[PDB]
Coordinates of all heavy atoms in Angstrom, one line a residue:
Chain A
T183 N 101.7 91.3 93.4 CA 103.0 92.0 93.9 C 104.3 91.2 93.5 O 104.4 90.0 94.0 CB 102.9 92.2 95.5 OG1 102.0 93.0 95.8 CG2 104.1 92.9 96.0
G184 N 105.1 91.8 92.7 CA 106.3 91.2 92.3 C 106.4 90.5 91.1 O 107.5 89.8 90.6
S185 N 105.3 90.3 90.2 CA 105.4 89.8 88.9 C 106.2 90.6 88.0 O 106.3 91.8 88.1 CB 103.9 89.6 88.3 OG 103.1 88.8 89.3
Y186 N 106.7 89.9 86.9 CA 107.5 90.5 85.9 C 106.8 91.4 85.1 O 105.5 91.0 84.6 CB 108.2 89.5 85.2 CG 108.9 89.8 83.9 CD1 110.3 90.1 84.0 CD2 108.3 89.8 82.6 CE1 111.0 90.5 82.7 CE2 109.0 90.2 81.5 CZ 110.4 90.6 81.5 OH 111.1 91.0 80.4
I187 N 107.2 92.6 84.8 CA 106.6 93.6 83.7 C 107.5 93.5 82.5 O 108.7 93.9 82.6 CB 106.5 94.9 84.4 CG1 105.5 95.0 85.6 CG2 106.0 95.9 83.2 CD1 105.6 96.5 86.2
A188 N 106.9 93.0 81.4 CA 107.6 93.2 80.1 C 108.0 94.6 79.7 O 109.2 95.0 79.7 CB 106.8 92.5 78.9
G189 N 106.9 95.4 79.5 CA 106.9 96.8 79.2 C 108.3 97.7 79.6 O 108.5 98.6 78.9
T190 N 108.7 97.6 80.7 CA 109.9 98.3 81.2 C 110.9 97.3 82.0 O 111.6 96.3 81.5 CB 109.7 99.5 82.0 OG1 108.3 99.6 82.4 CG2 109.8 100.8 81.1
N191 N 110.9 97.5 83.3 CA 111.5 96.5 84.2 C 110.4 95.8 85.1 O 109.2 96.2 85.1 CB 112.5 97.1 85.2 CG 113.9 97.3 84.6 OD1 114.2 98.5 84.5 ND2 114.6 96.2 84.2
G192 N 110.7 94.7 85.7 CA 109.8 93.9 86.4 C 109.2 94.4 87.7 O 109.2 95.7 87.9
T193 N 108.8 93.5 88.7 CA 108.2 93.9 89.9 C 106.9 94.9 89.7 O 107.1 95.9 89.6 CB 109.1 94.6 91.1 OG1 110.0 93.6 91.3 CG2 108.4 94.7 92.4
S194 N 105.7 94.1 89.6 CA 104.5 94.9 90.0 C 104.4 95.1 91.4 O 105.0 94.4 92.2 CB 103.2 94.1 89.4 OG 102.1 94.3 90.1
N195 N 103.6 96.1 91.7 CA 103.4 96.4 93.1 C 102.1 95.8 93.7 O 101.7 96.0 94.9 CB 103.6 97.9 93.4 CG 105.0 98.5 92.9 OD1 106.0 97.7 92.8 ND2 104.9 99.7 92.4
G196 N 101.3 95.3 92.8 CA 100.2 94.5 93.1 C 98.8 95.2 93.1 O 98.6 96.1 92.5
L197 N 97.9 94.5 93.7 CA 96.5 95.0 93.7 C 96.2 96.3 94.5 O 95.6 97.2 94.0 CB 95.5 94.0 94.2 CG 95.3 92.8 93.4 CD1 94.2 92.0 93.9 CD2 95.2 93.1 91.9
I198 N 96.9 96.5 95.7 CA 96.6 97.5 96.7 C 96.8 98.9 96.0 O 95.8 99.7 96.0 CB 97.4 97.3 98.0 CG1 96.6 96.5 99.0 CG2 97.4 98.8 98.7 CD1 96.8 95.0 98.7
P199 N 98.0 99.2 95.4 CA 98.3 100.3 94.8 C 97.2 100.7 93.7 O 96.8 101.8 93.5 CB 99.7 100.3 94.1 CG 100.4 99.3 95.1 CD 99.3 98.3 95.5
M200 N 97.0 99.7 92.9 CA 95.9 99.8 91.9 C 94.3 100.1 92.6 O 93.7 101.0 92.1 CB 95.7 98.6 91.0 CG 94.9 98.9 89.8 SD 94.1 97.4 89.2 CE 93.2 96.9 90.6
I201 N 94.1 99.3 93.6 CA 93.0 99.6 94.5 C 92.8 101.0 94.8 O 91.9 101.8 94.5 CB 92.9 98.8 95.7 CG1 92.5 97.3 95.4 CG2 91.7 99.3 96.6 CD1 91.4 96.9 94.6
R202 N 94.0 101.4 95.2 CA 94.2 103.0 95.6 C 93.9 103.9 94.7 O 93.3 105.0 94.9 CB 95.7 103.1 96.2 CG 95.8 104.2 97.3 CD 96.2 103.6 98.6 NE 96.6 104.7 99.5 CZ 97.4 105.8 99.2 NH1 98.0 105.8 98.1 NH2 97.6 106.7 100.3
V203 N 94.1 103.6 93.3 CA 93.7 104.5 92.2 C 92.3 104.6 92.1 O 91.8 105.6 91.8 CB 94.5 104.0 90.9 CG1 94.0 104.7 89.6 CG2 96.0 104.1 91.1
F204 N 91.7 103.3 92.3 CA 90.1 103.3 92.2 C 89.5 104.0 93.3 O 88.5 104.6 93.1 CB 89.7 101.9 92.2 CG 90.0 101.3 90.7 CD1 91.2 100.7 90.3 CD2 88.9 101.4 89.7 CE1 91.3 100.4 88.9 CE2 89.1 101.0 88.4 CZ 90.3 100.4 88.1
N205 N 90.1 103.9 94.6 CA 89.5 104.6 95.6 C 89.5 106.1 95.5 O 88.7 106.9 95.7 CB 90.2 104.2 96.8 CG 89.6 104.8 98.2 OD1 88.4 104.7 98.4 ND2 90.4 105.2 99.1
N206 N 90.8 106.5 95.0 CA 90.8 108.0 94.7 C 90.0 108.5 93.6 O 89.5 109.5 93.9 CB 92.4 108.3 94.3 CG 92.6 109.7 93.9 OD1 92.7 110.2 92.9 ND2 92.7 110.5 95.0
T207 N 89.8 107.8 92.4 CA 88.8 108.1 91.4 C 87.5 108.1 91.7 O 86.5 108.9 91.2 CB 89.1 107.2 90.2 OG1 90.2 107.8 89.4 CG2 87.8 107.1 89.3
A208 N 87.1 107.3 92.8 CA 85.8 107.3 93.3 C 85.5 108.6 94.2 O 84.6 109.0 94.1 CB 85.5 105.9 94.2
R209 N 86.5 108.8 95.1 CA 86.4 110.1 95.9 C 86.3 111.2 95.1 O 85.5 112.2 95.4 CB 87.7 110.1 96.9 CG 87.6 109.2 98.1 CD 88.7 109.3 99.1 NE 89.1 110.6 99.2 CZ 90.4 111.1 98.8 NH1 91.1 110.4 98.1 NH2 90.7 112.4 99.0
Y210 N 87.1 111.4 93.9 CA 87.1 112.5 93.1 C 85.7 112.8 92.4 O 85.2 113.9 92.3 CB 88.1 112.3 92.0 CG 88.1 113.3 90.9 CD1 88.3 114.7 91.2 CD2 87.9 113.0 89.5 CE1 88.2 115.7 90.2 CE2 87.9 114.0 88.5 CZ 88.1 115.3 88.9 OH 88.1 116.3 87.9
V211 N 85.0 111.8 91.9 CA 83.8 111.9 91.2 C 82.4 112.0 92.1 O 81.7 112.8 91.9 CB 83.6 110.9 89.9 CG1 82.6 111.5 88.9 CG2 84.9 110.8 89.3
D212 N 82.3 111.2 93.0 CA 81.3 111.3 94.2 C 81.6 112.2 95.2 O 81.6 113.3 95.2 CB 80.9 109.7 94.7 CG 80.4 108.8 93.6 OD1 81.1 108.1 92.9 OD2 79.2 108.6 93.4
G213 N 78.2 106.6 96.6 CA 79.2 106.0 95.6 C 80.2 105.0 96.4 O 81.1 105.4 96.9
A214 N 79.5 103.8 96.5 CA 80.2 102.8 97.2 C 80.8 101.8 96.0 O 80.2 101.7 95.1 CB 79.4 102.0 98.2
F215 N 81.9 101.2 96.4 CA 82.6 100.3 95.4 C 82.8 99.0 95.9 O 83.5 98.8 96.9 CB 84.0 101.0 95.0 CG 84.2 101.2 93.6 CD1 84.1 102.3 92.9 CD2 84.7 99.9 92.9 CE1 84.3 102.2 91.7 CE2 85.0 100.0 91.6 CZ 84.8 101.1 91.0
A216 N 82.3 97.9 95.2 CA 82.7 96.5 95.8 C 83.6 95.9 94.9 O 83.6 96.1 93.6 CB 81.3 95.7 95.7
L217 N 84.6 95.3 95.4 CA 85.7 94.6 94.7 C 85.6 93.1 94.8 O 85.6 92.6 96.0 CB 87.0 95.1 95.1 CG 87.3 96.6 94.9 CD1 88.4 97.0 95.7 CD2 87.6 96.9 93.5
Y218 N 85.7 92.5 93.7 CA 85.6 91.0 93.7 C 86.8 90.3 93.3 O 87.5 90.6 92.4 CB 84.6 90.6 92.8 CG 83.1 90.7 93.4 CD1 82.5 91.9 93.6 CD2 82.4 89.6 94.1 CE1 81.3 92.0 94.3 CE2 81.4 89.6 94.6 CZ 80.7 90.9 94.7 OH 79.4 91.0 95.5
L219 N 87.3 89.3 94.3 CA 88.5 88.5 94.1 C 88.5 87.1 94.6 O 87.8 86.8 95.6 CB 89.5 89.3 95.0 CG 91.0 89.4 94.5 CD1 91.9 88.9 95.6 CD2 91.3 88.8 93.0
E220 N 88.9 86.2 93.7 CA 89.1 84.7 94.1 C 90.3 84.5 95.1 O 91.2 85.2 94.9 CB 89.3 83.9 92.8 CG 88.1 83.9 92.0 CD 88.1 82.8 90.8 OE1 88.5 81.7 91.1 OE2 87.5 83.2 89.7
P221 N 90.0 83.8 96.1 CA 91.1 83.6 97.2 C 92.3 83.0 96.8 O 93.2 82.6 97.7 CB 90.1 82.8 98.2 CG 89.2 82.0 97.5 CD 88.8 82.9 96.2
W222 N 92.6 82.5 95.6 CA 93.9 82.0 95.2 C 94.8 83.1 94.8 O 96.0 82.9 94.3 CB 93.9 81.1 94.1 CG 92.9 81.3 93.0 CD1 91.8 80.9 92.8 CD2 93.3 82.4 92.0 NE1 91.3 81.5 91.7 CE2 92.1 82.4 91.2 CE3 94.3 83.1 91.7 CZ2 92.0 83.2 90.0 CZ3 94.3 83.9 90.5 CH2 93.1 84.0 89.8
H223 N 94.3 84.4 94.6 CA 95.2 85.5 94.2 C 96.2 85.6 95.2 O 96.0 85.7 96.4 CB 94.3 86.7 93.9 CG 94.9 87.7 93.0 ND1 95.9 88.6 93.5 CD2 94.8 87.8 91.7 CE1 96.3 89.3 92.3 NE2 95.7 89.0 91.2
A224 N 97.4 85.9 94.7 CA 98.7 86.0 95.5 C 98.6 87.3 96.6 O 99.2 87.1 97.6 CB 99.9 85.9 94.7
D225 N 97.9 88.2 96.2 CA 97.7 89.4 96.9 C 96.4 89.3 98.0 O 96.0 90.3 98.6 CB 97.5 90.7 96.2 CG 98.6 91.1 95.4 OD1 99.8 90.8 95.8 OD2 98.6 91.6 94.2
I226 N 95.9 88.1 98.2 CA 94.7 87.8 99.0 C 94.6 88.4 100.3 O 93.7 88.9 100.8 CB 94.1 86.5 98.8 CG1 92.7 86.2 99.4 CG2 95.1 85.4 99.5 CD1 91.8 87.1 98.8
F227 N 95.7 88.2 101.0 CA 95.8 88.6 102.5 C 95.6 90.0 102.6 O 95.0 90.5 103.6 CB 97.1 88.1 103.3 CG 97.1 86.8 103.6 CD1 97.7 85.6 102.7 CD2 96.6 86.3 104.7 CE1 97.5 84.4 103.0 CE2 96.5 84.8 105.1 CZ 97.0 84.0 104.3
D228 N 96.3 91.0 101.8 CA 96.2 92.4 101.9 C 94.8 92.6 101.4 O 94.1 93.7 102.1 CB 97.3 93.0 101.2 CG 98.6 93.0 101.7 OD1 98.7 93.3 102.9 OD2 99.6 92.8 101.1
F229 N 94.2 92.0 100.3 CA 93.1 92.3 99.8 C 91.8 92.3 100.8 O 90.9 93.1 100.9 CB 92.7 91.5 98.7 CG 91.3 91.6 98.1 CD1 90.9 92.7 97.4 CD2 90.3 90.7 98.4 CE1 89.6 92.8 96.9 CE2 89.0 90.8 98.0 CZ 88.7 91.9 97.2
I230 N 91.9 91.2 101.7 CA 90.8 91.1 102.7 C 90.8 92.1 103.9 O 90.0 92.3 104.6 CB 90.6 89.6 103.2 CG1 91.9 89.2 103.8 CG2 90.3 88.8 102.0 CD1 91.9 87.7 104.3
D231 N 92.0 92.9 104.2 CA 92.1 93.7 105.1 C 91.9 95.2 104.6 O 92.1 96.2 105.4 CB 93.5 93.8 105.7 CG 93.8 92.5 106.5 OD1 92.7 91.8 106.9 OD2 95.0 92.0 106.7
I232 N 91.5 95.4 103.3 CA 91.3 96.8 102.7 C 90.5 97.7 103.6 O 90.5 98.8 103.3 CB 90.7 96.5 101.2 CG1 91.4 97.4 100.3 CG2 89.3 96.8 101.1 CD1 93.0 97.1 100.3
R233 N 89.8 97.1 104.6 CA 88.9 97.9 105.5 C 89.2 97.8 106.9 O 88.6 98.3 107.9 CB 87.4 97.5 105.4 CG 86.8 97.9 104.1 CD 85.3 97.7 104.0 NE 84.5 98.5 105.0 CZ 84.1 99.7 104.7 NH1 84.5 100.3 103.6 NH2 83.4 100.3 105.5
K234 N 90.5 97.2 107.3 CA 91.0 97.0 108.6 C 91.6 98.4 109.0 O 92.2 99.2 108.2 CB 92.1 96.0 108.7 CG 91.7 94.7 109.5 CD 92.8 93.8 109.7 CE 92.5 92.4 110.4 NZ 93.5 91.5 110.2
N235 N 91.7 98.7 110.3 CA 92.2 99.9 110.9 C 93.7 100.1 110.8 O 94.4 100.7 110.1 CB 91.7 100.5 112.2 CG 91.8 102.0 112.3 OD1 91.5 102.7 111.3 ND2 92.2 102.4 113.4

Side-chain angles (χ1 to χ4, degrees):
Chain A
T183 300
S185 306
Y186 173 86
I187 299 169
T190 14
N191 280 118
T193 299
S194 151
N195 313 325
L197 291 191
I198 280 81
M200 193 209 62
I201 295 299
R202 211 116 172 307
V203 170
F204 282 87
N205 187 42
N206 182 259
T207 271
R209 284 176 41 248
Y210 172 60
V211 202
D212 298 87
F215 224 106
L217 301 160
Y218 275 80
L219 214 233
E220 297 191 34
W222 48 256
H223 201 277
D225 295 325
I226 188 57
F227 281 92
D228 285 315
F229 172 76
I230 59 177
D231 295 338
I232 228 54
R233 289 185 73 80
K234 257 188 185 169
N235 206 48

